[PDB]
Amino acid sequence: GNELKYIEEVFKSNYIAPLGEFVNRFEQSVKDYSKSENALALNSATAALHLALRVAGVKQDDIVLASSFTFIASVAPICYLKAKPVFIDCDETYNIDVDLLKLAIKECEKKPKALILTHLYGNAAKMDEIVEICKENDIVLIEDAAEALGSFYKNKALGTFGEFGVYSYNGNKIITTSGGGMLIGKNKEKIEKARFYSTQARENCLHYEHLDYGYNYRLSNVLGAIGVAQMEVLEQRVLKKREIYEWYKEFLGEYFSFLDELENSRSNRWLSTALINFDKNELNACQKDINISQKNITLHPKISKLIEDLKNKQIETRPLWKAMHTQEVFKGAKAYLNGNSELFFQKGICLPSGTAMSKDDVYEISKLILKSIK
Amino acid sequence: GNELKYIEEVFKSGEFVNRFEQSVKDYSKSENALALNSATAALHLALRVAGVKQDDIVLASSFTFIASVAPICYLKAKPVFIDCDETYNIDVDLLKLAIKECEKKPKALILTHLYGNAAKMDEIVEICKENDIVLIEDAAEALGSFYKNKALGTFGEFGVYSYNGNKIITTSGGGMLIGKNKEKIEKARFYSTQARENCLHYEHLDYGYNYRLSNVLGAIGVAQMEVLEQRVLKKREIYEWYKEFLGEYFSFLDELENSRSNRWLSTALINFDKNELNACQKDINISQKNITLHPKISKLIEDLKNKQIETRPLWKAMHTQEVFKGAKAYLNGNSELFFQKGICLPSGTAMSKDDVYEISKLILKSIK
Ligand SMILES: Cc1ncc(COP(=O)(O)O)c(C=O)c1O
Ligand SMILES: Cc1ncc(COP(=O)(O)O)c(C=O)c1O
Numbered sequence: 123g124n125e126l127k128y129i130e131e132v133f134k135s136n137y138i139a140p141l142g143e144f145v146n147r148f149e150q151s152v153k154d155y156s157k158s159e160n161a162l163a164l165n166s167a168t169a170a171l172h173l174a175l176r177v178a179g180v181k182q183d184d185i186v187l188a189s190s191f192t193f194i195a196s197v198a199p200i201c202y203l204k205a206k207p208v209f210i211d212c213d214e215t216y217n218i219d220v221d222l223l224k225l226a227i228k229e230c231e232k233k234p235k236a237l238i239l240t241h242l243y244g245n246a247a248k249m250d251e252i253v254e255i256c257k258e259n260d261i262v263l264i265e266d267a268a269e270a271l272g273s274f275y276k277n278k279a280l281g282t283f284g285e286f287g288v289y290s291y292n293g294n295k296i297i298t299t300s301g302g303g304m305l306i307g308k309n310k311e312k313i314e315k316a317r318f319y320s321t322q323a324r325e326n327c328l329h330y331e332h333l334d335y336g337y338n339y340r341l342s343n344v345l346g347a348i349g350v351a352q353m354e355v356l357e358q359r360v361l362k363k364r365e366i367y368e369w370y371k372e373f374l375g376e377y378f379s380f381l382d383e384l385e386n387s388r389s390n391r392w393l394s395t396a397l398i399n400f401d402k403n404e405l406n407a408c409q410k411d412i413n414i415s416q417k418n419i420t421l422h423p424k425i426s427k428l429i430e431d432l433k434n435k436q437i438e439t440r441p442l443w444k445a446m447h448t449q450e451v452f453k454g455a456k457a458y459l460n461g462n463s464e465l466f467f468q469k470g471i472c473l474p475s476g477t478a479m480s481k482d483d484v485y486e487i488s489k490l491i492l493k494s495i496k
Numbered sequence: 497g498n499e500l501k502y503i504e505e506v507f508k509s510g511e512f513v514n515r516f517e518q519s520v521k522d523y524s525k526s527e528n529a530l531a532l533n534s535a536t537a538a539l540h541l542a543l544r545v546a547g548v549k550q551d552d553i554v555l556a557s558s559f560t561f562i563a564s565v566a567p568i569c570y571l572k573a574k575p576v577f578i579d580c581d582e583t584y585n586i587d588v589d590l591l592k593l594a595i596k597e598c599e600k601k602p603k604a605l606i607l608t609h610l611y612g613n614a615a616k617m618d619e620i621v622e623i624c625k626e627n628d629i630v631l632i633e634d635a636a637e638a639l640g641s642f643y644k645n646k647a648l649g650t651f652g653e654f655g656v657y658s659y660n661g662n663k664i665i666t667t668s669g670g671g672m673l674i675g676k677n678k679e680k681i682e683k684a685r686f687y688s689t690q691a692r693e694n695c696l697h698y699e700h701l702d703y704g705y706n707y708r709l710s711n712v713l714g715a716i717g718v719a720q721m722e723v724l725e726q727r728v729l730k731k732r733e734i735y736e737w738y739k740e741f742l743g744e745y746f747s748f749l750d751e752l753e754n755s756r757s758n759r760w761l762s763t764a765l766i767n768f769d770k771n772e773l774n775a776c777q778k779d780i781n782i783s784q785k786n787i788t789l790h791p792k793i794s795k796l797i798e799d800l801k802n803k804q805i806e807t808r809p810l811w812k813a814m815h816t817q818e819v820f821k822g823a824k825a826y827l828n829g830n831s832e833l834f835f836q837k838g839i840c841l842p843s844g845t846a847m848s849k850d851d852v853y854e855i856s857k858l859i860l861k862s863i864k
Contacts, residue, residue, distance in 0.1 A: 126507060133500065142665035169706070194704075195706055299711045329809045342665070343668075345713070451703050467697075
C-alpha cells in the first residue's frame with residue numbers, strides 16, 4: 123500500500139507540519155469506517171483495554187466478566203488493576219454463551235462492573251442479547267474487537283455496541299512489523315480522559331503539572347502512517363479473507379466443519395478455522411461453575427498429525443486459543459463452563475489466511491491436509 | 497540517516513529489533529538489552545522483575561519527569577522522593593538520611609540522570625550495595641553520557657534509555673532496558689510479550705504485557721544509534737557555544753569530574769550562585785505547591801515565543817505535585833530553586849554556531 127509513501131512524508135514534513143498528523147488521520151479513518159464518534163490511537167489493543175477499564179471506573183477487587191476462549195492479552199488489563207476476572211465459556215460462534223453469562227451474573231455475590239467481550243477470530247457474538255443483558259444489569263460493555271475490525275452485526279460495526287471498543291492491527295506473533303491499537307467509544311468525555319492518561323496525565327500548564335498519574339500509551343506518527351495505509355485497504359482485505367474462507371470450505375467441507383457466522387452478520391474471517399470429526403450435538407456437554415486450576419487439553423489425533431505433516435511441507439498451522447479457565451495464571455478464579463472451548467481446542471485448526479494467497483495456494487494446502495487426515 | 501533505508505528493507509521483508517538491541521550493547525557494553533515501546537515500560541518491567549510488590553518502598557529522584565516514577569504507582573508501591581545536588585541529581589546525604597529513617601528497607605532506587613548529567617555514581621552504587629537496594633538507572637535522557645568512561649545505565653542492576661523526547665506525540669518511539677543479570681532480563685523479555693510459555697499453543701503461568709518494540713521502530717532505533725556519537729558531540733558543542741555567549745549572566749554548572757554529560761538538552765540558571773545551594777533542609781509529607789518562576793525567566797520564555805523560538809522551564813519536582821500528596825520527600829531546596837531560575841534552551845543538532853549566537857542575542861536583549 124502507501125505505507126512507505128506516508129512514512130517518507132512523516133520524516134520529510136516533521137519539521138513543519140501539525141503535530142501527530144498521521145495519528146489524527148488514522149483515528150479519523152477508523153471513525154469513518156466504524157461510524158464511532160470517538161477514536162484514540164494507542165500503542166496496543168492491550169493498552170486500549172487497560173485505559174477503557176480505568177476510565178470505566180474499575181478498581182482493585184472489582185469484578186470483571188470476560189471470555190474464557192480468547193487471547194490472554196484481552197484480560198491481562200484486569201490483572202493490572204488488580205480486579206477479579208470471572209470467565210465464561212463460549213457458544214457456536216466461538217463467543218460468550220448467553221445462558222452462561224446470565225447464570226454468572228445471577229450467581230455473583232458482588233455485581234460485575236464490566237464485561238470484556240471478545241469477538242473471536244472476527245466472529246460476531248450474539249449482540250442483541252448481550253447488549254440487553256448488560257444494560258439491564260448495569261454492566262459496562264467493552265468489546266475486544268482486536269481481530270474483528272471489518273466485522274459487522276446487522277450492518278453495525280463490531281466495537282460500536284459497547285461503551286468502549288478496541289481494535290488491533292498486526293496479529294499476535296511475538297514480534298511484528300508494525301504495532302498499534304485503537305480505543306473507540308460512545309462517551310466523548312471518557313475517551314478524552316483516556317487521551318489524557320495516554321500521555322502521562324499532564325495538566326494544561328506551561329510546565330509539567332500532575333493531579334493524577336498516567337501512561338506512555340500514545341501511538342507514534344510513524345505507526346499512525348502505517349495505520350492509515352492499512353485502513354485504505356481494509357475492506358479489500360476483508361473481502362479476500364472471506365474468499366479464502368470459502369475456498370477452504372469448498373475444498374475441506376467434506377471432512378471439516380465450518381461453523382456459520384450469525385445470520386445478518388458479517389465476519390471478517392481474519393483467520394480461517396475449522397473443526398475435524400465434529401457434530402453440533404457435541405455442544406453444551408455441561409453447565410458448571412468451577413474454581414480454575416491448570417489443565418492440559420489433548421489435541422485430536424488427526425489435528426496433531428495435521429500440524430506436524432503440514433509443518434514438514436513448510437506450511438504453518440496452529441491450534442485454536444487455549445481457554446483461560448485451563449491456565450495456571452488464573453488459578454482460583456471463577457469460571458462457568460459448558461465444555462465448548464475445550465472441545466474446539468481439541469478438534470480445531472487455525473489455517474493460513476494471508477490475503478496474498480491465491481486460490482491455488484489454498485487448494486494446495488487443502489490437498490496436503492486431506493492427505494494427512496486419511 | 498538510514499531510517500528510510502532500513503524501513504524499506506523491513507517492508508521488503510524482528511531483524512531490526514535484534515540489531516537495535518545489539519547496537520545498544522555495542523555502545524554501552526551491557527551484556528543484556530531488551531527493546532520495548534517506551535522507557536516507562538522498561539522501568540515498569542525492571543521494578544517487577546526486581547521483585548517490587550504492592551506497598552513496598554521505592555526511592556526515587558524528585559527532580560525528574562513523572563514517566564520515571566509512574567511505574568511505582570502501577571505496582572501500587574510507595575514512593576519516597578529525594579532532592580538533588582549541583583549535578584541536578586539525587587543528593588548523596590539526603591539519600592543516606594532517607595534510608596536511615598525508612599520504617600522498612602526500601603526495595604529499590606530509581607535514579608534519574610537529569611538532562612544527561614551523571615549522578616555521583618561511586619557513592620550511590622556503594623550506598624545501594626551496603627543496604628541491599630536494587631539500583632535502577634533512569635537514563636532516558638542520558639544515552640551517550642559517561643561516568644569515569646563507563647556508560648550511564650550500566651552501573652545499576654537495570655538501566656533504561658529513551659529515544660524520542662517528550663512531545664505529546666512523537667515521530668518514532670521506543671525504549672531500551674539493559675541489565676547485568678541475563679536471567680532477569682530474559683524474564684522481562686518474557687513479560688514483554690504476554691508471558692507466553694515456549695510451546696505450540698498459548699500457555700500462561702503468569703500474566704504479562706504487550707511492551708515489545710515493533711520491527712519498524714526497531715529499524716529507526718538502529719539508525720538513531722549509528723549516529724548517536726556524532727549527535728552527542730554536536731550537543732556538547734552547542735552547550736559550549738551557549739556558555740560562551742551567555743556565560744556572563746547565566747550559570748552552566750559543570751559536569752562531575754571525569755564524567756561526560758551528553759548535554760542532550762542545554763540548560764542554564766539566571767542570577768545564580770553556588771552559595772544559595774542547600775538553603776532549605778527538611779522533609780515533608782507532600783502537598784501540591786506552586787512555584788513562581790524568576791521574573792526574568794518567565795519574561796524570557798515569553799519574548800522568545802513571540803520570536804517563534806521555543807524554550808521551557810525545567811522539570812517541576814515530584815514533591816510539589818498533587819498526584820503524590822501524602823508521600824514522603826527529603827529536601828534541601830535545590831530542585832525548587834533550579835525550577836525558579838532555570839531555562840531549557842533550544843538544542844537541535846542542526847543548529848549552527850551562528851544560530852546559537854542569534855538565539856543568545858535575543859536572550860541577552862530579553863534580560864537586558
Ligand atoms: C482477540 C484479541 N484480543 C486482544 C489482543 C491484544 O492486542 P495487542 O496485541 O495489539 O496488544 C489480541 C492480539 O492482537 C487479540 O487477538
Ligand atoms: C528523564 C526522563 N525519564 C523518563 C522518560 C520516559 O520515557 P518514554 O517517553 O520513552 O516512556 C523521559 C521521556 O523521554 C525522560 O525525559
